[PDB]
Design an enzyme around this catalytic site. Structure first.
Site, short mmCIF file in Angstrom:
data_model
loop_
_atom_site.label_atom_id
_atom_site.label_comp_id
_atom_site.label_asym_id
_atom_site.label_seq_id
_atom_site.Cartn_x
_atom_site.Cartn_y
_atom_site.Cartn_z
N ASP A 15 -2.19 12.90 -5.25
CA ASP A 15 -0.89 12.95 -4.58
C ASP A 15 0.25 12.41 -5.45
O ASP A 15 1.40 12.69 -5.14
CB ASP A 15 -0.89 12.07 -3.32
CG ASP A 15 -1.78 12.54 -2.19
OD1 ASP A 15 -1.92 13.74 -2.00
OD2 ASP A 15 -2.36 11.67 -1.52
N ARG A 29 5.52 11.06 -5.53
CA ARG A 29 4.61 11.56 -4.49
C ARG A 29 4.93 13.03 -4.27
O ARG A 29 6.10 13.35 -4.02
CB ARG A 29 4.83 10.85 -3.15
CG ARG A 29 4.01 11.38 -1.99
CD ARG A 29 2.52 11.17 -2.16
NE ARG A 29 1.71 11.40 -0.95
CZ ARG A 29 1.48 12.56 -0.37
NH1 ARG A 29 1.89 13.69 -0.93
NH2 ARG A 29 0.81 12.60 0.77
N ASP A 34 -1.13 16.88 1.21
CA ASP A 34 -1.98 15.72 1.34
C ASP A 34 -3.36 15.99 0.73
O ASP A 34 -4.09 16.87 1.19
CB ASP A 34 -1.93 15.26 2.79
CG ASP A 34 -2.57 13.90 3.03
OD1 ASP A 34 -2.35 13.00 2.21
OD2 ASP A 34 -3.33 13.82 3.96
N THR A 35 -3.69 15.26 -0.33
CA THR A 35 -5.03 15.30 -0.91
C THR A 35 -5.91 14.25 -0.23
O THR A 35 -5.40 13.23 0.24
CB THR A 35 -4.99 15.06 -2.42
OG1 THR A 35 -4.42 13.77 -2.69
CG2 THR A 35 -4.25 16.14 -3.18
N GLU A 37 -8.36 11.00 0.02
CA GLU A 37 -8.40 9.75 -0.73
C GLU A 37 -9.69 9.75 -1.57
O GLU A 37 -10.63 10.45 -1.23
CB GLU A 37 -8.27 8.56 0.24
CG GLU A 37 -6.90 8.45 0.92
CD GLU A 37 -5.73 8.00 0.04
OE1 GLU A 37 -5.98 6.99 -0.66
OE2 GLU A 37 -4.59 8.56 0.05
N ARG A 75 8.73 5.63 -3.75
CA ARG A 75 8.21 6.75 -4.52
C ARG A 75 9.20 7.91 -4.48
O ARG A 75 9.78 8.21 -3.44
CB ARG A 75 6.84 7.23 -4.00
CG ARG A 75 5.80 6.14 -3.90
CD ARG A 75 4.45 6.67 -3.43
NE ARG A 75 4.56 7.12 -2.05
CZ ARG A 75 3.57 7.61 -1.32
NH1 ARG A 75 2.35 7.57 -1.77
NH2 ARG A 75 3.84 8.14 -0.14
C1 LIG Z 1 4.73 13.14 1.38
C2 LIG Z 1 5.61 12.14 2.10
C3 LIG Z 1 5.13 10.96 2.51
N1 LIG Z 1 5.91 9.99 3.11
C4 LIG Z 1 5.31 8.79 3.68
C5 LIG Z 1 4.84 9.09 5.09
C6 LIG Z 1 3.58 8.29 5.22
O1 LIG Z 1 3.93 7.01 5.80
P1 LIG Z 1 2.74 5.98 6.19
O2 LIG Z 1 2.31 5.26 4.88
O3 LIG Z 1 3.40 5.03 7.11
O4 LIG Z 1 1.55 6.67 6.80
C7 LIG Z 1 3.05 8.17 3.79
C8 LIG Z 1 1.95 9.11 3.38
O5 LIG Z 1 1.78 9.00 1.95
P2 LIG Z 1 0.30 9.01 1.34
O6 LIG Z 1 -0.33 10.29 1.86
O7 LIG Z 1 0.51 8.92 -0.17
O8 LIG Z 1 -0.32 7.78 1.85
O9 LIG Z 1 4.17 8.40 2.93
C9 LIG Z 1 7.23 10.25 3.43
O10 LIG Z 1 7.90 9.46 4.06
N2 LIG Z 1 7.72 11.45 2.98
C10 LIG Z 1 7.00 12.45 2.34
O11 LIG Z 1 7.58 13.51 2.04
CA LIG Z 2 -3.16 11.18 0.32
#
Ligand SMILES: Cc1cn([C@H]2C[C@H](OP(=O)(O)O)[C@@H](COP(=O)(O)O)O2)c(=O)[nH]c1=O
Ligand SMILES: [Ca+2]
Length: 129
Positions: A15, A29, A34-35, A37, A75
């Protein structure tokens, strides 16, 4: 949307990568994906796929969408390109990511990715097998 230069600092996982953007290190990011973990099924294979793609590229570009450019973790949120190929799309096409985190105003490439996902699913690739 416009592609902008960046240089790989370090592949991280399916990701994310650490990239140098405007001369500053940043975790990026990938938008709309979503990949799994690393400890989940196909998680290692997603990280390996992106790692090869970005490490082998002669040119890395980042493309921001129209909305938020950074998430709540600091990110960068972008479409990442390796020698002109979008890593976000390539992951979904190979069934190593799902289309996910589709928020209004940061969804320019949503339909392109969904088409890719439909094809991976039809082919029963990786996550869809
Ligand atoms: C891809 C993406 C993730 N995020 C946030 C939402 C998720 O919040 P939460 O951490 O509260 O679940 C998290 C998921 O990223 P990861 O999939 O890298 O964990 O990153 C955004 O806010 N915008 C985006 O476009
Ligand atoms: Ca992920």
């Amino acid at each position: 949307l416009h592609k902008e230069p960046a240089t790989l600092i370090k592949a991280i996982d399916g990701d994310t990568e650490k990239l140098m953007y405007k001369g500053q290190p940043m975790t990026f990011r990938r938008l709309l994906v979503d990949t799994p973990e690393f400890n989940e099924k196909y998680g290692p294979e997603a990280s390996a796929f992106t790692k090869k793609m970005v490490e082998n590229a002669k040119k890395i570009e980042v493309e921001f969408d129209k909305g938020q450019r950074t998430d709540k973790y600091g990110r960068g949120l972008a479409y990442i390109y390796a020698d002109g190929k979008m890593v976000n799309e390539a992951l979904v096409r190979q069934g190593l990511a799902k289309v996910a985190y589709v928020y209004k105003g940061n969804n320019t490439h949503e339909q392109l990715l969904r088409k890719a996902e439909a094809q991976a699913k039809k082919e029963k690739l990786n996550i869809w097998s």
